Curated annotation (Swiss-Prot), chains A, B:
NCBIfam families: ATPase-IIIB_Mg, ATPase_P-type, PRK15122.1
Transmembrane parts of this sequence: 95-115, 117-137, 288-308, 318-335, 696-715, 725-744, 767-790, 800-818, 832-851, 867-886
Annotated compartments: Cell inner membrane
Classification via InterPro entries: ATPase_P-typ_cation-transptr_C (IPR006068), ATPase_P-typ_cation-transptr_N (IPR004014), ATPase_P-typ_cyto_dom_N (IPR023299), ATPase_P-typ_P_site (IPR018303), ATPase_P-typ_TM_dom_sf (IPR023298), ATPase_P-typ_transduc_dom_A_sf (IPR008250), HAD-like_sf (IPR036412), HAD_sf (IPR023214)
Root EC class: translocase
Taxonomic lineage: Bacteria, Pseudomonadati, Pseudomonadota, Gammaproteobacteria, Enterobacterales
Underlying gene: mgtA
GO biological process annotation, one example: magnesium ion transmembrane transport
Extracellular-side positions: 116, 309-317, 716-724, 791-799, 852-866
Role according to the record: Mediates magnesium influx to the cytosol.
Protein name: Magnesium-transporting ATPase, P-type 1
Reaction(s) the record says it catalyses: Mg(2+)(out) + ATP + H2O = Mg(2+)(in) + ADP + phosphate + H(+)
Induction: Induced by low levels of proline and by osmotic shock. The leader of mgtA mRNA functions as a riboswitch, favoring transcription under low Mg(2+) conditions. Under limiting proline levels the MgtL peptide encoded within the mgtA leader cannot be translated, thereby favoring the transcription of the mgtA ORF. Induction by osmotic shock also depends on translational regulation by MgtL. Induced by low extracellular levels of Mg(2+) via the PhoQ/PhoP two-component regulatory system.
Quaternary state and interactors: Interacts with MgtS.
Length: 898, 898
């Protein structure tokens, strides 16, 4: 076996259509051990004075104009990884043409027909070129469509730039790949860092660097450094880094590095620069290509040997063997996949489902466990009923005003509670509070405490810290409560009463958020998390988030498909259970996060296969649950649109996000839904299953037909005193058959093939070929006998009649057999193909019939066929179709279709 | 003018595709003054002993088997009105062929070519027959599709019948039209009475006879009569009548009359049997047909006179004039409409919108005011949050148990509150109450008091009356309240406190339903409405009905289309205002029902044009508001699925209902949505606008082209010494052009034509014809000059070259001009037709080109065309297209497209 040189033979698809993106959150080890050049440059750039920063990157405060931005892009490259730049079209055409098979075909043609027999090798090379341009056009169009689809949903950044010739400055939303060094951008809540940044100004900027430094708590970034110099570049309080997000606050910064020059650009791109292990799709494609190479390299040399030993001329024998082996070439796969999946992707783009990389289309059809969250998917993002009450249950205006202050003076991500509180407060009181209070500091949201705080002041004497969050976390840091207008210590009886009331509200489906306030003396230092102590619990706000009207039918459709929906949510188990009961999902027994830390990996993996609803989950818990759900042969899809959903989305077999979400939840995702709905996801899953079924059918049919032709040639060449068909005719047959098959990506797929999650077995293609090759072979032998005896083509002098006699049988049957071997159901009555496929089949059949009668037949060494041959050909085709229809049942019983 | 004989000429479409159904609720006057035969038969059948009832109608207790049911159907006809039976296909073909135009054409052909010139009139009659069969096939297919669509959503009844050969009896759901006299059916809540019925058994059967007797309160129907004999047939307490609904209770009855033999069957069908005034659609179709008849009868006689005076033979002149006038025949309209609207209807059937009668498709596109209800459309039918509390606000199990008793022991229509109460009660307590309490009597729901009551008993000593309803109505009949476990008199302070609490709950969007209980001594008499007094108010249940997620986008799309959505609801104004604010609708100022009784018709009509939300409306108020909303040139659509929505649905210009609803809300409706959603309605409105635009475009283009041909013939006949074209060639041109236009119903419509509600002006067709006729005449004259001078067709001996020379110009231009005159936008770049239309255009153009060169041309008196004529024809076509494109702008400016 061996066949290491097959690595030369197999051409791999570009690494952007298949396989995921780097996702700069991984490999916490020291790649290149923080290389001294990069570390020194970052350290020097951190404390760089602001004045010479303008000269260093040739940047002006007003921004950059056109000529400058293209000059900078030319000098420093583009804001992309080296694996993200598509090759030029002429390079793609050359690499398509430079394959060993076409070059060897041309060389063999020149050698065989160099004996003054020109216009033969010329036509062979012309056919080779026509096939090459066909493949190149297919691949180029599909790759362009896929790249456009991937660029439709891309992370954007807000830049100063220059508008119009007048030089006016605005705020353009441009894709991150268009960024150049020395570009001024602005950062808000939820926007990821697109490249290395030098902070020009910052208002309470807290960013999440857990991806790089491994610390979950957000860190503060200021305009000027506030710490003595430290070696660690990632700890600089004035430089941002690509791959991190902005938790809260606002900023305006300048790009100091881009593309591969960025910190992550070296990391795992150039610092490691190792060979990435191929994913599931690439492995299957490699298996298919290797199987085709094995079959070709096994059978073609036998044909070569037989023809050389018997016929005579060895060169023509080798040319003929290569021509028949071209049918089973492995370089059709780079087109086929690209020609099929991209089409589905385009169709998915019309179903509000953008596919960033074609590989996902496989997994998106193979998904059988879909982890999600109650918010957005199950229930809406807008809450209908909300009542602001104190601990006694009566409506309290103090609680509503404190919540309004906290929501209005926050700078983090917008929340449904914040919007509801802002809308539910009257304009007069809202403006009175706005003109009466002023913001000072903000303590953002983090999962260690799950509380958000804002410190404001009504004067310069005292400050008020107003915090809000989940009930238990607020109660943990509350010592006093404002009951009946008096501040009374919060004893155990009131705690238990509050707990039972909130438990009843949760059981009714109401989410409860508690609010506390505290008064402190005025101080200059920033407020830390330690300041949330001895608070005064003003009250709690209970709000109802109604389930979506379409959630239950979508869940039913998903269960019908076979996708077991599981809920991984950080909310209370009571609210999650009520929501699941409302939407019809079977909660069963709930598992909280605190009950999985003690459990081992095996125990959690054994419990995750039976539990439907998981509550009170930290992002680490979500990542662990998703990771342990794939081991038992399950393809897992995770749907989320949160800040910390990047590890969960990346760890899942497929990640699905929404167009409106934080950047890190879109960069890490593989599928982007234009709207957050389960019905759209289910329809997209069905259509992706159809697309993958179409691709598999294409590969199966092409391989089976070409292997059957090769087997017929191998078995029947010895007895004949000449070539059964001229290799030029075989190339014509292959080209016309490929042109006919062009329409297969548009075929229809039976609902039986797409009723269950798809499992792809590359070894099934070999069984299909072995089963469906001799079928065609038998009728090839019958046609050979018919031409040898009935039509008296017994001598080479009349061989032209013989070969053409097979040609029309070779092309049409190969074209017709598709309609018999595309469905397990009986064709034309129980299952039908698509109109383009039938049109192409009929047109190609007509062209093949008319080729011997066309004036070109003389140039193609084709002789006209007598009218008596037509009934025999029709009978042969009918017998072939009937036999394959009656034989498909045995293949269905022994091995099965899907 | 006069032209009364045009009534003979115009063929009217069948009265089932256009115009509504009888809807047996109308004309409260005494039609036939209660004819003595029917009244006596009903009176005798009412008190008929049950024993001889079986023999009277040949019915057995087990039901009827097949042979008996077909025998009864043959004897007594079918359960349909005389206007609902479609004619046989051969009758339709004959009536299509029996039109004056085709008969006159055949007679003139025989007269003109009876001078031994056979095979001429024969071919003319063959072409006449081909056109007749084309029209008949189109009409028959479209009518069959429309009838199938109307039968898809039809009121059904549950019948005993016989299942299988074993004789087993089941309960078949069969359409009401299949009912035969002497058939046993069962009646439940919400099922309308399908035909005259004799009640065999009844359990608390209360039916609504407000349609016939005019009394809003439901009346009781018993198995045996309980009143002394009374003359009025409609007051019989044992006979049901078609057109009425079952408010509550169960029954099993026998059909005693069917079809026209039913009480309503005489009423307005045979008792009156008057000429129904045509609706909007029929009037417009009559106007179009009359305009075409006027144009034809004006211009054709002039051509006849000119040709007879100049050419010679009068018979051939009359034949030629009739042949050119055939282009403007008015009997194409019965096909066109039926061929277009039905197609849209079929498409509407794929958008979950079933159209019962094609006429609706006009109004459904012309709708600009859509009256609806908050339940179902705006909000969902399932309530998420519900809390059962007493007057003090604490949760009370007594209130929940009383509501459970009332909901479980009711027999009326199921309600969202009833389902929520049934689901929210634990199984143990529910079964304990079920085994502990037993139903005795029920006082159903009616709008005079808006309260429902059920009288049950735990023993034989005392009975408990449990009633529920709106808060104010319950409080009106409550004197005591169970507060803190003690029965205390309900004073004014508690009333005001309850009112303010419930007002706050309504302002939060919670609907509040109060429940009262009372204890009475055991008695044998039935409980009446007077028993609801001195009740004990147990408490109230507040439940939240969340708005649908898709309501706001659907309302935005409807407003973008131009359909002003108005809400006519009987709920409280606070809840309706909160729902409207939630869904984004502008409530503005609300109008309650009590504030429209004093207002006059003019005042209410001037107020309903500015008010968006109407609250606390009785069904009479809804009917009045809908009636007064159409006078100011507005097409009003009413959407409802209630028992009393039949007057509102019928009084509106169009009525839309849901598949799942009471029967009387489906019989009275014109459109049936498979699901209750506003988005489906908006998409259906858009598609119906497209369909009506397609129909109008078809009529306009056909009339304009044929009028242009007639004008060319009229102007250019005098100078020529022979017929410009043989009438056989004109018939060929008309047939081929119609075959080309067949694909117009499948055309594409610009979004500009369907962006606003459509207004149809029949007089616009005349202006369009006048504008676009001479444009097609100028080039006809140019072609005449080209054939006369350039090609030297100066003598009748070479007239065959001349006529054919026009023929190819006549057919292709008429076919091509469509792509220029179908859109106001520039063709082929800014607006494009549909693939079937382009395919048909190209195919018909090819056929017309090849006809002179075909061997049939000799039989059709067509001569082959020289190759030099092709460039001239191409130039003529290009000039015609360019001139019409440049001229369309003037028509757009002066009159406008839509
Ligand atoms: Mg942003
Ligand atoms: Mg600070
Ligand atoms: Mg073959
Ligand atoms: Mg029913
Ligand atoms: Mg009773
Ligand atoms: Mg014309």
């Amino acid at each position: 076996m061996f066949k290491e040189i097959f690595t030369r033979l197999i051409r791999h698809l570009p690494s952007r259509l298949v396989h995921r993106d780097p996702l700069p959150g991984a490999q916490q080890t020291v790649n290149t051990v923080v290389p001294p050049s990069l570390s020194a440059h970052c350290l020097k750039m951190a404390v760089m004075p602001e004045e010479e920063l303008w000269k260093t990157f040739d940047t002006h405060p007003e921004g950059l104009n056109q000529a400058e931005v293209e000059s900078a892009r030319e000098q420093h490259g583009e804001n992309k990884l080296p694996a993200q730049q598509p090759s030029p079209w002429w390079v793609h055409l050359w690499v398509c043409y430079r394959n060993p098979f076409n070059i060897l075909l041309t060389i063999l043609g020149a050698i065989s027909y160099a004996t003054e027999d020109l216009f033969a090798a010329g036509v062979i090379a012309l056919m080779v070129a026509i096939s090459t341009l066909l493949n190149f056009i297919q691949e180029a169009r599909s790759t362009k469509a896929a790249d456009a689809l991937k660029a439709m949903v891309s992370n954007t950044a807000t830049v100063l730039r220059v508008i119009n010739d007048k030089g006016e400055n605005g705020w353009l939303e441009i894709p991150i790949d268009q960024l150049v060094p020395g570009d001024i951008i602005k950062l808000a809540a939820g926007d990821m860092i697109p490249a290395d940044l030098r902070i020009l100004q910052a208002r309470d900027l807290f960013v999440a660097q857990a991806s790089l430094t491994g610390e979950s708590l957000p860190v503060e970034k200021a305009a000027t450094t506030r710490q003595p110099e430290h070696s660690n570049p990632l700890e600089c309080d004035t430089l941002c880094f690509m791959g991190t997000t902005v938790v809260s606050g606002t900023a305006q910064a300048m790009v100091i590095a881009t593309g591969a020059n960025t910190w992550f650009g070296q990391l795992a791109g150039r610092v490691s620069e190792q060979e990435s292990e191929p994913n599931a799709f690439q492995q299957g494609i490699s298996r298919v290509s290797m199987l085709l190479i094995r079959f070709m390299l096994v059978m073609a040399p036998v044909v070569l040997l037989i023809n050389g030993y018997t016929k005579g001329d060895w060169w023509e024998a080798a040319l003929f063997a290569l021509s028949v082996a071209v049918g089973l070439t492995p370089e059709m796969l780079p087109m086929i996949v690209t020609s099929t999946l991209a089409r589905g992707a385009v169709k998915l783009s019309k179903q509000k489902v953008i596919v960033k990389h074609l590989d996902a289309i496989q997994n998106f059809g193979a998904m059988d466990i879909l982890c999600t969250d109650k918010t957005g998917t199950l229930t809406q993002d807008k809450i209908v009923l909300e009542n602001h009450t104190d601990i006694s249950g009566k409506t309290s205006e103090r609680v509503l005003h404190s919540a309004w202050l906290n929501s209005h003076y926050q700078t983090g991500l917008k929340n449904l509670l914040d919007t509801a509180v802002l809308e539910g407060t009257d304009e007069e009181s809202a403006r009175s509070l706005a003109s009466r209070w002023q913001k000072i500091d903000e303590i953002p949201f983090d999962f260690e405490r799950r509380r958000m705080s804002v410190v404001v002041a009504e004067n310069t004497e005292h400050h008020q810290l107003v915090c809000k969050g989940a009930l238990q976390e607020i109660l943990n840091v509350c010592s006093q409560v404002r009951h009946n207008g008096e501040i009374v210590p919060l004893d155990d009886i009131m705690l238990r009463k509050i707990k039972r009331v909130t438990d009843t509200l949760n059981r009714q489906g109401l989410r409860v958020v508690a609010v506390a306030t505290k008064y402190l003396p005025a101080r200059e230092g920033d407020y830390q998390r330690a300041d949330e102590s001895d608070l005064i619990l003003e009250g709690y706000i209970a709000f109802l988030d109604p389930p979506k009207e379409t959630t239950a039918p979508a869940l039913k459709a998903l269960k019908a498909s076979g996708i077991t929906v599981k809920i991984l949510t950080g909310d209370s188990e009571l609210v999650a259970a009520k929501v699941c009961h409302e939407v019809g999902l079977d909660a069963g027994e709930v598992v909280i996060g605190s009950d999985i830390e003690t459990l081992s990996d095996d125990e959690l993996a054994n419990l995750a296969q039976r539990t439907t609803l998981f509550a009170r989950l930290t992002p680490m818990h979500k990542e662990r649950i998703v990771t342990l759900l794939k081991r038992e042969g399950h393809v897992v899809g995770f749907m989320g649109d949160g800040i910390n959903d990047a590890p969960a989305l990346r760890a899942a077999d497929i990640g699905i996000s929404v167009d409106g979400a934080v950047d890190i939840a879109r960069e890490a995702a593989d599928i982007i839904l234009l709207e957050k709905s389960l019905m759209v996801l289910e329809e997209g899953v069905i259509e992706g299953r159809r697309t993958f079924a179409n691709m598999l059918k294409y590969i199966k049919m092409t391989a089976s037909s070409n292997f059957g032709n090769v087997f017929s040639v191998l078995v029947a060449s010895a007895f004949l005193p000449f070539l059964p068909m001229l290799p030029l005719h075989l190339l014509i047959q292959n080209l016309l058959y490929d042109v006919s098959q062009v329409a297969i990506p548009f075929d229809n797929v039976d609902d039986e093939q797409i009723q269950k999650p798809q499992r792809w077995n590359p070894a099934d293609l070999g069984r299909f070929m072995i089963f469906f090759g001799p079928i065609s072979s038998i009728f090839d032998i019958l046609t050979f006998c018919l031409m040898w005896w009935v039509f008296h083509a017994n001598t080479p002098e009349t061989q032209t009649l013989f070969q053409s006699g097979w040609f029309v049988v070779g092309l049409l049957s190969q074209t017709l057999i598709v309609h018999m071997i595309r469905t397990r159901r009986v064709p034309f009555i129980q299952s039908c193909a698509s109109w383009p496929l039938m049109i192409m089949t009929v047109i190609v059949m007509i062209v093949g019939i008319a080729l011997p009668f066309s004036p070109l037949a003389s140039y193609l060494q084709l002789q006209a066929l007598p009218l008596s041959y037509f009934p025999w050909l029709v009978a042969i085709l009918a017998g072939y179709m009937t036999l394959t229809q009656l034989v498909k049942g045995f293949y269905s019983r022994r091995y099965g279709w899907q």
